[PDB]
DNA sequence: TTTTTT
């Protein structure tokens, strides 16, 4: 049933619904034929999950490789996250015959760099096959679900939403799930509910899953934050049909801008959310907008993230990073994006001699684009100039506030800029040149 | 305006 292993190195796709067997059954079949298999997964929870399942399901203790915990058993199957894979240097000479890229539809930097690395080191490593497994191929669109009944929202309702209202009796009793775009509107909405008799509790990254009651009537308002360690299954799911993402804009003022905004969810999103209800029973799905953007497209800012991570985390020179990205972009059947490898690569090539300390701090702070952020901070300090603003993303310069004066040597725009700006800095001029 | 992985 699983894609046969060819004589020479080949790259094969694998499209199947109900993503689950592709990462358990499939890898198990191959191993039965005396094959060495590596199953890459974006999630750490999943990577760990599969490890325990394979044991009881196929009597085999797979190898587990994640950032946190690592387990070596010597078995023919190895489960790992893309992050950990990259951190290990990528494909190890002669170690696997088959490399499965699970959830290859994921358009996040870590997955993309990971997949791009496998497509570039697989053959030379000895692998005889690479499987790009996913349940939602590029161009997918939400399809009706058996145990789920989707109902739109109208003006009618005592709870204002994102252009519509939500009938109080709709969530009056039972367990329901409400998806909001921001973490602040989650609390705001939980308020208008909790202080209205209803037992509502907001959830998002940073909070503990225990906050949500295992049973009883409850209205959970959360973000797309995973509820690791919690079994979903809600009576109904109300979705705002919007996501918060980062997009690049070549605003030439003076260079580029990476802004974070909200955008109508795509198929994969509308599906994942709607999928939290209708498990082993009849569920409902209330939305604000019917339409949906076809999956299979990510923004150029994502490519920018890959170079940043390659510089901040995986010790990859811009050039090196371009090799792996190029392979990913040269392989059909994967999410597409404007080819800006040359541009992004040139930009990072000029960001040399960053401050070790600053880099460390932005990385430790878990800030997006730690390299770009740390580099801007590096330039500012090096010019005794204040940062673009004193927003939490520049806290690595706080101790230097007293001696920082004048305009900020703006290299690019990563959010709001409250301080006065200059554009005379050589690095700004270099990046201005790359825009051409 | 979020999440996730190094």
Residue where the block lists tokens 């034929």: A33
Q: How far is C-alpha A67 from the geometric centre of its chain's CA atoms?
A: 16
Q: Are A100 and A36 in contact (CB under 8 A)?
A: no
Q: How many CB atoms lie within 10 A of CB A353?
A: 9
Find the nucleotide nearest A363 (Cα to C1′).
Answer: B6
Tokens at A266, concatenated: 């795509």
Q: How far is C-alpha A197 from the geometric centre of its chain's CA atoms?
A: 36
Resolution (A): 2.8
Q: Which residue is nearest to nucleotide B5 (CA to C1')?
A: A83
A269 touches strand B (CB under 7 A): no
Q: How far apart, in Å, are the Cα atoms of A13 and each of A22, A100, A157, A166, A200?
A: 11, 10, 46, 42, 43
The pairing of strands A37-41 and A98-101 is parallel
Chain A window 157-196, residues with Cβ within 7 A of nucleic strand B: 181-184
> A103 a known binding residue?
yes
CA–CA dist A237, A179 (Å, integer): 8
Nearest CA-CA partner of A37 in A88, A83, A102: A102
Q: For A325, phi and psi rounded to 5 degrees?
A: -70, -45
Chain A window 360-419, residues with Cβ within 7 A of nucleic strand B: 363, 366, 368
Give the burial string for A294-310 (b: 16+ CB within 10 Å, else e).
ebbebbbbbbbbbbbbb
CA–CA dist A291, A152 (Å, integer): 11
Nearest CA-CA partner of A371 in A355, A392, A390, A389: A355
Sorted by sequence, the CB contacts under 8 Å of residue A27 that are 6+ apart come out as A37, A39, A77, A98, A100
The pairing of strands A257-264 and A242-249 is antiparallel
Q: What is the largest CA-CA distance in chain A?
A: 68
Taking the C-alpha atoms of A177, A242, A148 and A275 in order, what is their torsion angle to the nearest 10 degrees? Answer: -70
CA–CA dist A88, A38 (Å, integer): 13
Chain B: bases < 7 Å from a protein Cβ: 1-6
CA–CA dist A210, A229 (Å, integer): 9
Q: How far is C-alpha A301 from the geometric centre of its chain's CA atoms?
A: 13
Q: Are A131 and A98 in contact (CB under 8 A)?
A: yes
Q: For A389, phi and psi rounded to 5 degrees?
A: -170, 175
Tokens at A390, concatenated: 């004193």
Chain A window 333-352, residues with Cβ within 7 A of nucleic strand B: none
A30 burial type by CB count under 10 A (0-12 exposed, 13-18 middle, 19+ buried): buried
What are residue A242's DSSP bridge partners? A264
Q: Which residue is nearest to nucleotide B3 (CA to C1')?
A: A225
Nearest CA-CA partner of A127 in A187, A196, A78, A180: A78
What are residue A203's DSSP bridge partners? A222
Tokens at A200, concatenated: 């509502």
Q: How many CB atoms lie within 10 A of CB A95?
A: 13
A258-CA/B5-C1' distance, Å = 20
Tokens at A260, concatenated: 């974070």
> A23 a known binding residue?
yes
CA–CA dist A253, A230 (Å, integer): 46
Tokens at A269, concatenated: 């999103």
Q: How many CB atoms lie within 10 A of CB A393?
A: 20
Nearest CA-CA partner of A117 in A93, A85, A95, A80: A85
CA–CA dist A52, A75 (Å, integer): 13
Nearest CA-CA partner of A334 in A111, A142, A83, A137: A137
Tokens at A308, concatenated: 């940043």
> A214 a known binding residue?
no
Nearest CA-CA partner of A165 in A77, A238, A95: A238
What are residue A98's DSSP bridge partners? A37, A129
Domains of chain A (ranges, CATH numbers): 1-138 (3.40.50.300), 139-242+264-295 (3.40.50.300), 243-263+296-436 (1.10.820.10)
CA–CA dist A98, A90 (Å, integer): 14
ω into A254 cis (within 30 of 0): yes
Q: How far is C-alpha A21 from the geometric centre of its chain's CA atoms?
A: 22
Q: Which residue is nearest to nucleotide B6 (CA to C1')?
A: A83
Q: Are A44 and A81 in contact (CB under 8 A)?
A: yes
Q: For A84, phi and psi rounded to 5 degrees?
A: -65, -35
Provide the residue count of chain A: 436
Q: How would you write chain A as a 3-class SS string?
A: CCCCCCCCCEEEEEECCCCCCCCCHHHHHHHHCCCCEEEEECCHHHHHHHHHHHHHHHCCCCEEECCCCEECCCCCEEEEEHHHHHHCCCCCCCCCCEEEECCCCCCCHHHHHHHHHHHHHHHHHCCCEEEEEECCCCCCCCCCCCCEEEEECCCCCCCECCCCECCHHHCCCCEEEEECCCCHHHHHHHHHHHCCCCCEEEECECECHHHCCCCCCEEEEECCCCCCCCCCCECEEEECCEEEEEEEECCCCCCCEEEEEEEECEHHHHHHHHCCECCCCCEEEEECCCCCECCCECCHHHHHHHHHHHHHCCCCCHHHHHHHHHHHHCCCCCCECCCCHHHHHHHHHCCCCCCHHHHHHHHHCCCCCHHHHHHHHHHHHHCCCCCCCCCHHHHHHHHHHHHCCCCEECCCECCCCCCCEECCCHHHHHHHHHCC
Find the nucleotide nearest A364 (Cα to C1′).
Answer: B6
A261-CA/B4-C1' distance, Å = 18
A143-CA/B1-C1' distance, Å = 29
Q: Which residue is nearest to nucleotide B1 (CA to C1')?
A: A182
């Amino acid at each position: 049933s699983p894609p046969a292993v060819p004589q020479t190195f080949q790259v094969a796709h694998l499209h199947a619904p109900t993503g689950s067997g592709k990462s358990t059954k499939v890898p198990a079949a191959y191993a039965a034929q005396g094959y060495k298999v590596l199953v890459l997964n974006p999630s750490v929870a999943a990577t760990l999950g599969f490890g325990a399942y394979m044991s009881k399901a196929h009597g085999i203790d797979p190898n587990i490789r994640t950032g946190v915990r690592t387990i070596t058993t010597g078995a023919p199957i190895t489960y790992s996250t893309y992050g950990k894979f990259l951190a290990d240097g990528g494909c190890s000479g002669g170690a696997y015959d088959i490399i499965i890229c699970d959830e290859c539809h994921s358009t996040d930097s870590t997955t993309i760099l990971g997949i791009g690395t496998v497509l570039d080191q697989a053959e030379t490593a000895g692998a005889r096959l690479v499987v790009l497994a996913t349940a939602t191929p590029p161009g997918s669109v939400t399809v009706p679900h058996p145990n789920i009944e989707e109902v739109a929202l109208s003006s009618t309702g005592e709870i204002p939403f994102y252009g519509k209202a939500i009938p109080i009796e709709t969530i009056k009793g039972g367990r329901h799930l409400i998806f909001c775009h921001s973490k602040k509107k989650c609390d705001e909405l939980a308020a208008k509910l909790s202080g209205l008799g209803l037992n509502a509790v907001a959830y998002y990254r940073g909070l503990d899953v225990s906050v949500i009651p295992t049973s009883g009537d409850v209205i959970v308002v959360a973000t797309d934050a995973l509820m690791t360690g919690f079994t979903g299954d809600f009576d109904s799911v109300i979705d705002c049909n919007t996501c918060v993402t980062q997009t690049v804009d070549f605003s030439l003022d003076p260079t580029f801008t990476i802004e974070t905004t909200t955008v109508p969810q795509d198929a994969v999103s509308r599906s994942q959310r709607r999928g939290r209800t209708g498990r082993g029973r009849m569920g409902i799905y209330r939305f604000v907008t019917p339409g949906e953007r076809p999956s299979g497209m990510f923004d150029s800012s994502v490519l920018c993230e890959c170079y940043d991570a390659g510089c901040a985390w995986y010790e990859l020179t811009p050039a090196e990073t371009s090799v792996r990205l190029r392979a990913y972009l040269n392989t059909p059947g994967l999410p597409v994006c404007q080819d800006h490898l040359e541009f992004w690569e040139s930009v990072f090539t000029g960001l040399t001699h960053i401050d070790a300390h600053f880099l460390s701090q932005t990385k430790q702070a878990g800030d997006n684009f730690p390299y770009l952020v740390a580099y801007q901070a590096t330039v500012c300090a090096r010019a005794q100039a204040p940062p673009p603003s004193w927003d939490q993303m520049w806290k690595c310069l706080i101790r230097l506030k007293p001696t920082l004066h004048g305009p900020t040597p703006l290299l690019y725009r990563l959010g709001a800029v409250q301080n006065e700006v200059t554009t005379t800095h050589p690095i700004t001029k270099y990046i201005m040149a790359c825009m051409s």
